[PDB]
Structure formats: C-alpha cells, structure tokens
Symmetry: D4
Subunit: 217 residues, 8 copies
C-alpha cells in the first residue's frame, strides 16, 4: 500500500531505490535516460522511462498513487526545481529532494519541498572529521555540543579495563560499547577489558572526547 | 597541524575542504575549473589551478610532500584513476578517493587507493532507512545487527517515565539521551519523562528497536 | 528621477531600457552577452557586462540600492529564477520578471517576484482579436465584459452623423473619438460626421460593440 | 470557411493559436518541432509537424485553403523570411509575421508581408510607461498627443466626486469610467464618487493626464 | 580606375578579387574569417577583417563611398540578404550578389540587388553541354537559338579545305577561326585546310552546328 | 546506352544533373544526404542515397555501367579525393571532378582524374571582366591574345552602319553579329545599322576590342 | 576449440582479427561501432555489435567461451581499462591489451593484464633504426648487445665471396643468409658470392655490425 | 649526422622522434597540438608548433632543406595527403608517410611518397602469430617461406644437447643462439645443452620450424 517513487536515478537516487527495494517496499524507478532505467529495473518493483519534467508523463505513471516521492536530480537545477513544483502542484504528501547548493535549497524551500537533502556535503564534513581525527570511525551528533563517537582501539588502550580507563570521572564521558574480533558487548560491566584494534563506542561532549583521544589514547 | 590536499573541488570535495579549513588545517584546494578554485579561495590555505592528471603540474604543486591527499573526482573515472595512480607512484602515504561505481572502486583497489568512499550510496541507504520509518532521525550501525538510533517522539509517549517504558528487559535495548526544547539530557534516570516531538537516543539490536517502535510508539 | 535596472537585454528588456532612457531615467543595462551590452550602450545610463546569477557580480553592480529591478530573461528559466531569488534575498522592493510558461510564473510567484509579465501571450491575444475582426485596430479591456475599442471606418459609414448612428440607446455604447486625416476630435458632438478609413474610438460592452460592428459597419 | 494558419508555435504564435481556437475559429498549428505540435494539438482544430520553410510540405498542408497566415517565427530570421516569401509566392491574401529587429521588418516589407508585428518591443514600451508611472495600469494611444489611460485610484482621490475632482475645467481631460469592488460605472454622472484603489479610466492629452497625476493624485 | 568591394572572399569572390587586382583596380577584400583575409592580402588593395552584417563595421569600412560592391556569400543566405539590404540602405549604385537557390534570388530581387549571379549553375550547364558532346570545347549563346561554338578536330577532318566543308550553304553556319599548334588564324579563307586536334571556332544555329558535328565530324 | 553518373549533388553537381536530364540523357543522381536525393529525384532518370566514399555502395549502384562519372564534391577534399581514387581503381573511362584549390587539382591530377573543373574561379574571372568593363555582356577567349566579345550597344553606336563604324580598317576587328529587339542578324552586310542597347558580337585581339570600346564607344 | 576474441576493431585490432582468421582460427570481432563490425564481418568467423565496456553484453557474447581475449582499444584509456577489468573479473585466462602510454601500461599491469603491447612505439623505434641506417631492412634483437640484421647489399659487396668478406675474423659476425633474385641461400658455404642489391642476413653484436656497415659497406 | 623532420607527433611519430634523438640526430618535431610539442621538447633538437598543411608555415620551418621527412599522421587522411604532396612539391628526397588504410596508401603512392609504413597492421600480424603459437617470442621473415624465429623453451627440452636435437637433417633448420639467465651464446656447438624458459633462436623454413615445435617441444 505504501508507495515510493524515486525520480532521478543517479548514485544517490539509485542507492535510495535499490535500498528501498531491498527492504521489501514498493518502489518505482523513473529516469529520462533509457540505460539508467534498464540498469535499475532489476532493483525496482517497476521501472519506466519518463521525462519527469513533463506533466503528461508524470500523470501517466500515476504519480498520485505514491505517498512518497524523491526527486534525486541534483545536477540539473531547473529539472529538479520544475519536477518538484509539478509534484507539489499535484498534491503529493511527502517530497524529498536532493539539493546542489544553498540557493537550490532556498528555491526548493520556497516552492514547498517537504525535505531537502545535501548528501555530498554531509559526507564531506563527516569524512573531514574522520580525516583530521584518524581515530574516529563513525559518530552521531546529539547536539552542537554532545555526540556519540565510535573509535578504533589504541596502542595505549590494549588490555585495559573500563575502570582502569575511567571516563565518567576522568573525562565526563560514558563507555557504551566494545567490539572485539566480531563480537559486540553492549552496556559493558566495569570489568570488561579492551584490546587493541577493537571498536570503542563512547558518548559525551565533543571536547571531553577529544581530550580522551589526546591523553587517554 | 597536518597537510591535506583536496583534488577535485566538487560538492563532496568542496565540503571536505571547507570543513577541514574551518577546523584550521592546511588544505590545498586543487581543481581544473578556474571558477571552482575561485569559489573556495577564502575557504582554504592555498587554492591553485592545476590539472591533476599531469605529472609535471603535480610536481609543481609539491604534492609529493603532502601526508593526506583526497581526490573527489567521481564522475570522471579516467581522471580519478590516473590521478590516484600518479599520487601512488609519488609514494603518498594516505590516498582517499571518491568512487562512482563498483568497477571504479575495484580499479582504485588495484592501483593502491588507501581509502575509497561512496558518499551518495551510503547517504541513500541512510535516507531510505529514514523513509521506511519516519521515526528515525539519525542512526549509526555498531555492526550488521546492533545500532544506536535517534527517534522522534510520538503522542503515544508524552509524559511517560523511562521506567514506565522498560527497554532493558522488555526489548533488551537502552535509552541513551533525551533532547527536549534545545536542552539535552545524557544517560538519563528512570524517573525522567518523555514529551512529544523530542529526540530519543536509544541503543540496541535493530529488530528490538523496531519492536519498540511498533509497540510503544 | 528613479533607479531602474534592466537585467537581460532582450527584445522585451531592450525595449524597456530604450524607452525608459528616452524618458530620462537612470537605467542600468545588464547582460552577459558583450555585444548586447554594446548594442544598448548609448541607450542607457550605465551598461555593464555581468552575470546576474553570480551574487558577487550583483554586489559589484551595487544592485542592492536600486528601487526597480526588471529581469527580462524568459527562455532561460534557471537563470531568471536564480536572479529573481537573488534580488529578493537582497531585499529589492520592486522586482518585475518576464516569464515564459505557467510553471515559470508559479516558481516566480513562490520566490517572491513582485510583478510577472507575459508579453508575447498578451500580444498574441490582442493580435488574434484583431485577426478575427479586421475592424479592430486597438483596444483596452475595462473588465471581462466592457472595453474601449478603436475601429477602422467602412464604406457603410462615410458621411454619416453621430446622431444618425445612435450608440447610446441602440446599443448602449458611447463614441469617444474621431481621428481623420492626421487630426483628432475628442468627445465629439452628435453633428460631427464620419468618413471612411477613419479611427473611431468607441466604448461599451464587447457584445454591444460587436453588434454595432455587424449592423452598422 | 474562414481559415487561419499559425506557423511558428512559440509564446507569441502559441498564444495566437490558442486564442483563435478559443474564439471558435478554424486554426492549423504548424511547427517543425514535434513536441510543440504535440503540446498545441489540444488547442488547435488541426495540428501537423511541418517544416514550413520547405515548399512541398506547405503545399501538402494545403496552405492555399487558408485566408490568413501568421508566421510567428521571430528568432530565426532566415526561416521566417523564406517562409514569408513562399507564402507570398503562393498567393496567400493576408500574411502577418512576427519580427525581430528593424532590418527583419525591412526585409519582410520588401518581400511583401501584409502585417509586421513587434510584440516584445510594444510590451516593453508599455511596461516602461507603467514602470515610470506607477499609477498607470493600462492605456491606449489615440495619437502622438492624445490617449485614454486607466489609473489606480489614489490616497487623494478617496471618497471624492467627479465635480469635486473636475477635470474638464481644471485639466481639459474627460472622466470616462469608474471601477469599484468589481462593479463598473460607464459614462458616470457628475455625482458619482471614487474610492481608493478603484480603477479610473480618463481620456485626454498626455501632458494634462500627467499634470492630473502630479497635482490631483 | 574604379572602386570595387568584394565582400565574402570565397572561391567565386576570391577569384573576382584576384582577377580585379591583377588588372590594377582598387579592390577591398572583406571577410569575417581571419585566414581568408590573410590569404588574399597580397591580391588586393585593402584587406580588412569585418562582419558585413554589422552596420557599424560597414560604416567603418567606408562602404558608402564605393561604386561597386560584390557580395559573394552564397551558402549563408541570411548574411548575404542582410548585407545586400544594408548596402542598398546605404544607397550603393552597383550591388552584385552571388545567390544559392531560386528563393535566395527572389529575396535579393525584392530587396534591390542590382545583379544576381549563379556561377555554379551556369558552369554546370556549360560542362553538361560539353559532356553530351565531346567535340565542344567552349561556346557562347547569342540567343536561345544561335551560338558561337568551339570544336576539337576529328580524324574525319584532317587536311580538308574550308571550301570542301561548305558551311555557309550546306548548314547555314560560318567558320570563324582555326587554332593550330599554338598559332591562330582569324576569319580564314576557303583555301585554308584543317588538321586533327585543332580548335575550330564556328558560328550559327545550334541545330545546324550539331548537324555538322554529325555529318562532317 | 550512354550513361552519366553525377556524384555530389550541390549547386554545380545539381545543375549538371538537371541539365543532363533536360537534354534527354541517362543520369543517376548520387548523394549522401537524403534530402538532396529527394530534391533531385524528380530531375534524374534515377536517384539513390549512397555514400560514394564507400566502395560497397558504389558497386551496388553499378558504377561500372556508367561511361561518364562526375564527382561534384568540391568542399570536402578527402571525400572527393577518395571517391575519385575509387572510380579510377574501378576502371571508369571518363572522370570529371569539381576542384576547390590548386592543391586539390594537383591531387586529382596525380590520382588520374580525366578532367578537373574550377567553376567558381572561372565565373569569378568572367564576372570581373564584365565588372571592370561594363560594356561586356559575355565573351569567349580564342587564345591568350584573341577573343570574341558580346557588347551592349552604346550612346555613340546608335543608328550607325557597319561601314560608318568600320572595324576591319580602323581597329582590325570583325563585325560578327547584331541583336535588335529580339531578332538576330548573322554575318551582317556592310549596310546593316546598329541601334542603342543592341547586342554587338565582335571578334579580334583583346587590345583592339578595348581600343574600340574606348574610342568607338 | 581454441577461441580468440578481438575487442576493439582498429588498425591493430583489425589486423590481429584478419590475420588470426587467415591462419584458420576461431575469431570473434567485437566493436561498438556498427560500421567496423560490418567491415570486419567478412574477415571473422563471427562478428557482433557489442559495447564491450558493458557487462551484460559481454556475457551475452559468451566471453567465457574464449581462451584468449585481445582488448585492442588503445585511444580510449577508460574503455580499455574497464573492459580489461571486466575480463579479468570474469576469469579469462589470457588477456592481451593494446596500450597508449606508460601510465596506461601501469594501470593494465595493476589490474592484471596478461600481456601489454605497444605497437606504434616498437614500430617507431624500428623505423628510426632503419632511418638512421639506410642499409637495414629489418632486424631482431637477441639481447641488449646482440642481434640479427638483414641488410641491402652494397656497391662494395658486389660479386664478393664470404671469405673475401670474412666477418668471423675481421668483425666477429657470422654470415647467415643470402637472397638473390628471389632465391634464398641458407647457411651458405664459404664459396658463395654476393651481388649488389641482394639481401644479406648477418648476426652478431650491434657494434661489430655497425663497423662492418661503415668499413665493409 | 643527418636531418630528420618528424611531422605529426603521435605514438608512432613520437617514438620515431624519441629514438632518433636518443641516437643523437638532428630531429625537428612538428605538430599542431601545443601540448604535443611541449611533450617532446626535451626529446628533440627543435620542437616547433606549425600546421604542416600550410605552405607558408612549411617554408617558415625551412623544411625544403631537410633530407628526411617523416609524416606520422594516420587518422587524418586529408592532412597527411596534402602534407605529403606539399613536401614532394618542395622536392624532398626522402618522404616517409604513415598510412591508415589501403586507399590512403594508394593515394600516397600516386602523389610520390617515398616509403609508406603500416605499423599497426604489421604489429598485429606479428602478435597474431605469437598468439597462435605461444612458443614464438619474436621472429623475422627472410621471405614468404623462410624465417629466423625465437622460441621459449619447454619442459620437453630441459638439459638436452644440441646434437640430441639434430635440426640440420631431421628438419633442415639451424639453431642459432641460446639465451639463458641473462647471458647469451651465439652460434652454439653440438655439446651445449638447453634448459627450460630459455630463448632459442633458430632459422629455417616456417613449416619445418613448426614441425620441430610440434615434435620436439
Ligand atoms: N526530467 C528529467 N530531467 C533531468 N534528469 C532526469 C529527468 N528524469 C530523470 N532524470 C535523471 O536524473 C538523474 C540526475 O542525475 P544528475 O547527474 O543530474 O545529478 P547528480 O546530483 O550529479 O547525481 P548523483 O545522484 O549521482 O549525485 C540523471 O540520471 C537523469 O537521467
Ligand atoms: N583532472 C582534474 N584535475 C583537477 N580537477 C579536476 C580534474 N577532473 C575533474 N576535476 C574537478 O573535480 C570536481 C568534481 O568532478 P566531477 O564533476 O567529475 O565529480 P562528481 O563526483 O560528479 O561531483 P560531486 O563531488 O559534486 O558528487 C570538479 O570541480 C572538476 O573541475
Ligand atoms: N545570467 C544572465 N545574466 C545576464 N544576462 C543574461 C543572463 N541570462 C541571459 N541573459 C541575457 O538575457 C537576454 C534575453 O535572454 P533570452 O534569450 O533567454 O530571452 P527571451 O525571453 O527568449 O528573449 P526576448 O526578450 O527577445 O523575448 C539576452 O541578451 C541574454 O544575454
Ligand atoms: N520551418 C521552420 N523553421 C524554423 N522554425 C520553425 C519552422 N516551422 C516551425 N518552426 C517553429 O517556429 C518557432 C519559432 O520560435 P523561435 O524560438 O524561433 O522564436 P522567438 O521569436 O524567440 O519566439 P516567441 O514567439 O516565443 O517570442 C519554433 O518553435 C520552431 O520550432
Ligand atoms: N557576414 C559576413 N561578413 C563577411 N564575410 C562573410 C560573412 N559571411 C560569410 N562570409 C565569408 O564569405 C565567404 C564565402 O561564404 P560561403 O562559404 O557561405 O560561400 P559559398 O557560396 O558556399 O562559397 P564559394 O564562393 O566558394 O562558392 C567566406 O570566406 C566567409 O568567411
Ligand atoms: N560520400 C560523400 N561524401 C561527401 N559528400 C557527399 C558524398 N556523397 C555525396 N555527397 C554530397 O556531395 C555534395 C558536395 O557539396 P559540398 O557542399 O561539399 O561542395 P561545394 O563545392 O561547396 O558545392 P557546390 O557544388 O554547390 O559548389 C554534398 O551535397 C554532399 O551531400
Ligand atoms: N566498449 C567500447 N568502448 C570503446 N571503443 C570500443 C568499444 N567496443 C569496441 N570499441 C572499438 O574499439 C576501437 C578502438 O580504436 P581507437 O580509435 O579507440 O584506438 P587506437 O589505438 O587509436 O586505434 P588503432 O588500433 O588503429 O591504433 C574503436 O574502433 C571502437 O569502436
Ligand atoms: N596538419 C597537421 N600539422 C601538424 N601536426 C598534425 C597535423 N595533423 C595532425 N597532426 C598531429 O599528428 C599527430 C598524430 O595524428 P593522428 O591522431 O591523426 O594520428 P594516428 O595515426 O591516429 O596516431 P598514432 O601515431 O598514435 O597511431 C597528432 O599529434 C596531431 O596533432
Ligand atoms: Na554527487
Ligand atoms: Na520573445
Ligand atoms: Na561553390
Ligand atoms: Na595507432
């Protein structure tokens, strides 16, 4: 019953479509280029060649049978803009659009895009964070000051316990998860040790985590 | 600090350069497009116009002394491949490369790319997960089975204590954080309550977290 | 006098610029085409080569201080849209935009265009009205029902007085003006006569005016 | 019986065709681009894909069954020129052609075009008139010195009568129409009042109308 | 001598310019192609780079004072037409124009071209006449019926006197000239003989000349 | 039986083909562009779409059933060169080729072209001769020193006889033909007169003809 | 049974395919351009139009029934690179690839190309050797110091024996073959003579051969 | 030394230039591509940017004094042909030309090319011979029947003497050289043995050599 349409098969849009189909959902792959439709037809419940900037073709797809629509056109600003305008004028509930710059974001905001995504920009900032800090594998920001960070275990952390490396007192951070040799310990007891090259999931303020990385690692 | 060289100022590479310079790192912005080098001039230490595939221009850039080199050319496969093979011939320790498809990733593997990144693919996976479940704001996967997940609160959770929603034994998860009205509570107590439209950071197995999303949300 | 800035010197925009400068107004002629800026140089106060979609060039033009800004780019939808959104971000009070189709008009509505113009459409309507009825030279519509209409005289009207063609009671209209042999009579008397190939300015309901065109012409 | 052919479907030509069809006439939409024919087929009694610069195709349309022919090609000077030459050499009674510049007008004049239209230029001068004079909504020029002008009612005109604002004596102009809240009074008696934001249709010399606008408004 | 201006240095126009300068005439070689103006520089009095369709450049060339202006642009119809209409607006007495097809010839007729030339067409007619009859070297048509024709001699004419081949009464023609071994005899006598592979200039009706070509050759 | 093939339908080639067909011959029109074949099919005994630079297509036309072949490709040097090489390697008796420059002539000479034609160049020199000498309508060169010239009769020649204007004694030229009001007198008697605007066909040395034009005209 | 696939029909690849077919082998000609397939279909046991950079098409050809595969694409570096990567990932035993530069060679080496060929470069060095030494017809290098060289017999060598021109003692080289008037003597006895313009196949160190050429020739 | 001029720096021509300069010859590297002239600057005596088809630039290069001129343009047939005809018109003694197909070779034959080379074709023949027989490393053909061939040794030949493999009488060939472990033995004795993975230089009839390859290898 729940229906997703993915217009603009690219890296972002193709990933969205393939992942939504893998999850067992109803997805329609839409693209103006025939080769992209041929490539993503195996990964969609239905795939059509449609110039989504044309109205008639959009109505022929039955764009109104879809609860969610994702305009993944991010390089052609005019195409994405007028596709989103068409979709909003056809009373589509949820419209998520890939953006290209701040001004494309402003245009999509003014025309009524329900969600605007900047994939390359967010990945750029995350990869820069992992770049300057070689210890960070991944993280998630709780706010402008707090976050949960996954770290690669260290020369200094090898064979040390959670009270030997106390963080709730020495840094104000909380030990959260340990990953060793494929196994994963959640909410670990104060007796658990950490070996080198393990995955340490910690949580707290960014500055305290950086201080732990500088002194405790 | 450190020495980063961002070849190919795109959305991804430009975000990398801007974020790295915001954190005060020496970042060399390299591109072939004059307007691209003009766009990130104030957002980098040195912004030079140069063709990265030419060995003479790479020697002119002094690229052999940089510790970190990130090429962000994804659409142009030949340029990215030859630039990566060049930098590897110049014996660069850290080479991070943005890829476009599986075969580009494999050809970067064979020529010695240190870290290959697929930004749009991972972001599409994340946004598709957020699309299938509107409650999920952000998340991070500890493995192929356990994750830390951020949720948006529901009318079904307004003014309900943490002990009322026992997640340690009813589902085997752990509530981690409560963001409310711009403030944030880390590692809360069983007596703290939940209002609607709050940010709930939980941690546990994916299936158990979604079981909560079904039963209690 | 006033401050007008005509971005996009086209046929429409070039006519605007030429006419406004003929009446002695400070008009800034802005275009990307060097030959276009060279064409209207003597027909404007300042004629500058600049890309209107670039924010830096718009700041260089001092466009933030102008009271009236008219962008005449119709064919290029993306350039017109981003220029309009730019000028609105710069808080311009009066933004007049030339449009190309309905969706361009809507996207200009959503980004805050002050007045959207469709020159070719309205002129086509007028010329089609003049085509269906060869008697109509020009006209202006007071509403969707009443108009002031200019006619070319017919052999059926040579040397016939205004009282002979009673239009106030026979059709409910009013004869307004009589152009003859380069001279012009405004608000004529019932004793003035009509010769053929004269300009007859009448006013009234469209259906009644055409009823006259049928019966008396 | 009366037949119109509209060659050159653009903004101007498309408007002409759609308006002529709305009026209940026989129109044939001709265009070299298939998409334009597909778009305007719903708005024409018949629509064909024809390269109107080719003779054979023009004869195949039966261009001789048409009393009126409108060459709305205004960007390609050679195409419009040779289409008009073909049409005049095929003994078409009325040929109306959209022009682009003064020299295209001269060429069409020399080859025998029955009417030459400059839509963008006329709209440019009219919009410039409405630009410098913010009170003018629309107008119609009776001669180089006299015209009928429609104006937006003023702060000063609110709740004032036609003898309180005497124009036949104080300015030499004639009150002609009033439009208030959707209703429209024609040839109004001296007792009618005028409220703010009403539409005031006046008629007279341009200088007297401007003096009224300066002092009386 | 005289003032010629060859606009559009092509094969035809370049030949005109080269031959006219060889005979010592002031010839202005005008073209848009820089290499074309460089090619005929030593073969003209003045060779200037200029766009002929621009009125300002034509005024810069001082083209209004030239007595003879020959535009040789044939492929580009619009450029040739506008250049011709320009030069006619500048009141040039002698305007010679190279045409490409019948409609280009007609549009040059209507805009006032003084002499329209079709070089390739006439040369094709001449070469086709020489192809149908290998005896014909060159010819000139006095009318649609009588011509002066040059023939190549045949074994059937070696050492035969002019009185032996009576052409004044047997066919009604006149033998005019005998070219033999680099020498040439004008208006020969009945006693002069003919050798093979000579140039025989005859004059008369086409049918009678070909009757000779059949019977005596 | 006699067969002509015309490859390269242009102005020159199209004229050759149309004139050869008008003469009642067997012509095959060959062109790579489909529109040219469609245009010249009505003027050829057979017309085909063939890329004449391909061998297989040439053999499929039966290029060997043709005694004469005319490569009228004059703008593409490589196409004409390799078509002529193919034709000579297929043992075609007579190959006549349109040339473009002296070096193309040399190439066609070396590869074995039977005849090389420079139509535009010859017409250029002839039109230049008619340009500098406004009296010359047409002519034919007998040698480097002698020629027959057709002239427009003169103010001075009006109503004068052939002995009154003696040329065999005063100039060494021979009176040859007179054309008056459509009639044409050949080999005229010494009593024939010449009126103004008549056509005077004279024959002799170029210098004597020029002296006659200067003094006798 | 033995199967060769030749992808990339060019001069090199076309020669490989035609020669392999002449030898009586099983060859499949693959090319993205239809005309190349049409040209080489007569010279291959099977020829198909296939975009070899696409996987699906490669599997459809049955690229796995081929023991040898030759990627003769040498101008498009990306196409050849990704075709070779596909072929190696499909477990093709022998992959021989035409290269373009040293860096393309390095890429093909890293991705696992079984053989890399530089045809133009090797022919360039061989033709340069024959250029500076006009006596060398062909040769074969045994090592960096020894080679067998074929030479054109000399003015000095005419009618001289193998002991009269002793090379095993005077130069350290070995006489190997003589070719005279089409006949060829192998391992010749000490009595054989050598005439001028014969072919002399000698073998030894490069320096001794050059000394023989300088003094003995 | 000598004077070589390499026009058209390609893979073949660039290899020629590099090898000839390595051997210390005055080589003029001529190309139209600026980057190509910049690439071989250090690998030539003089590297000049020039269009070879322009006669003026060829005179500027002083090409008329060079003894050897090698044009390596193969893809561009017209440029190569006109350059060759130019250099032949300048009476160059030695003109070597790279060809692309048979007809290009013939047109170079007809215009007087001294030596025409087909590098890719001959290399394809050689590599196809090495493909049909993996034992063949290199070879040189003494005629259409006898060759000197280099083989890779087989397990079937390890530690077998030359007299054990009698090739003079069993097959009529002669073993010439044995390369082993970087050393090389010329004209070996019957007592020398053969190890596997050695280079065996043999000489004789092709059929007899392959008979050995079958029976003894
Ligand atoms: N009407 C349309 N107009 C334009 N593109 C369309 C349309 N319909 C579908 N598409 C497809 O949308 C895709 C948008 O990809 P594009 O290259 O423009 O963006 P991108 O942001 O660079 O891509 P990526 O998602 O890989 O980051 C293209 O594959 C295009 O074929
Ligand atoms: N050889 C090169 N040398 C330097 N810069 C280059 C080179 N090739 C491409 N670039 C630059 O790389 C940038 C990104 O290239 P491209 O458009 O191929 O990437 P993309 O992956 O499609 O973009 P995005 O990063 O926005 O997803 C551009 O600014 C381009 O100018
Ligand atoms: N970004 C820009 N900045 C400045 N000038 C621009 C820009 N984009 C277009 N123009 C100019 O706008 C003018 C008109 O543009 P365009 O051809 O798209 O309009 P049009 O509506 O088709 O024309 P017309 O006004 O004659 O109907 C041109 O002179 C062009 O150079
Ligand atoms: N034979 C033809 N040659 C050229 N255009 C043709 C022909 N037949 C039809 N057309 C159409 O005529 C139209 C002319 O529009 P064009 O863009 O050239 O003019 P314009 O003056 O800029 O348009 P507008 O009327 O919107 O102001 C095009 O849509 C074109 O497809
Ligand atoms: N507007 C222009 N102003 C000046 N020169 C021009 C202009 N347009 C074209 N030319 C020149 O006219 C010459 C001939 O033009 P074109 O190729 O259209 O003629 P053509 O009739 O095909 O040639 P040919 O005379 O060889 O038969 C060229 O040298 C070109 O550069
Ligand atoms: N194989 C072919 N290659 C190229 N042109 C071909 C071929 N076969 C036929 N043609 C035709 O030959 C004609 C040659 O005309 P082109 O414009 O090249 O020469 P031109 O000398 O400028 O012409 P013109 O005869 O009018 O002076 C073209 O119409 C082309 O379509
Ligand atoms: N997938 C493909 N991508 C690109 N080219 C392909 C592909 N499949 C076949 N081909 C063919 O491979 C050939 C490669 O020739 P190309 O001109 O690129 O190389 P080259 O090294 O200059 O050639 P040559 O072998 O003559 O030296 C072309 O004819 C092309 O049509
Ligand atoms: N007229 C010219 N004058 C000078 N250089 C030229 C000219 N035309 C082509 N070249 C040069 O010749 C070189 C080779 O040309 P092209 O690409 O046609 O040859 P190719 O045979 O395909 O190449 P390769 O030698 O690698 O097989 C290029 O560097 C090109 O710039
Ligand atoms: Na992207
Ligand atoms: Na317009
Ligand atoms: Na021509
Ligand atoms: Na090559």
């Amino acid at each position: 019953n729940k229906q997703f349409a993915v217009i603009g098969l690219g890296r972002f849009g193709g990933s969205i479509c393939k992942e939504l189909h893998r999850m067992g959902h109803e997805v329609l792959a839409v693209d103006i280029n025939e080769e992209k439709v041929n490539a993503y037809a195996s990964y969609a419940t239905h795939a059509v060649i449609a110039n989504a900037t044309e109205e008639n073709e959009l109505l022929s797809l039955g764009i109104r049978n879809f609860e969610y629509v994702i305009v993944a056109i991010g390089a052609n600003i005019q195409a994405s803009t007028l596709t989103t305008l068409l979709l909003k004028e056809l009373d589509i509930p949820n419209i998520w659009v890939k953006a290209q710059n701040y001004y494309h974001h402003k245009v999509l905001e003014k025309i009524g895009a329900d969600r605007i995504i900047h994939p390359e920009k967010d990945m750029g900032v995350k990869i820069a964070q992992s770049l300057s800090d070689e210890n960070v594998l991944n993280y998630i920001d709780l706010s402008d000051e707090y976050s949960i960070v996954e770290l690669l275990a260290t020369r200094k952390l090898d064979s040390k316990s959670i009270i030997d490396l106390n963080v709730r007192a020495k840094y104000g951070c909380t030990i959260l998860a340990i990953k060793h040799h494929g196994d994963i310990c959640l909410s670990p007891a104060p007796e658990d040790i950490i070996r080198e090259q393990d995955c340490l999931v910690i949580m707290g303020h960014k500055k305290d985590i950086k201080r732990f990385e500088n002194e405790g690692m």
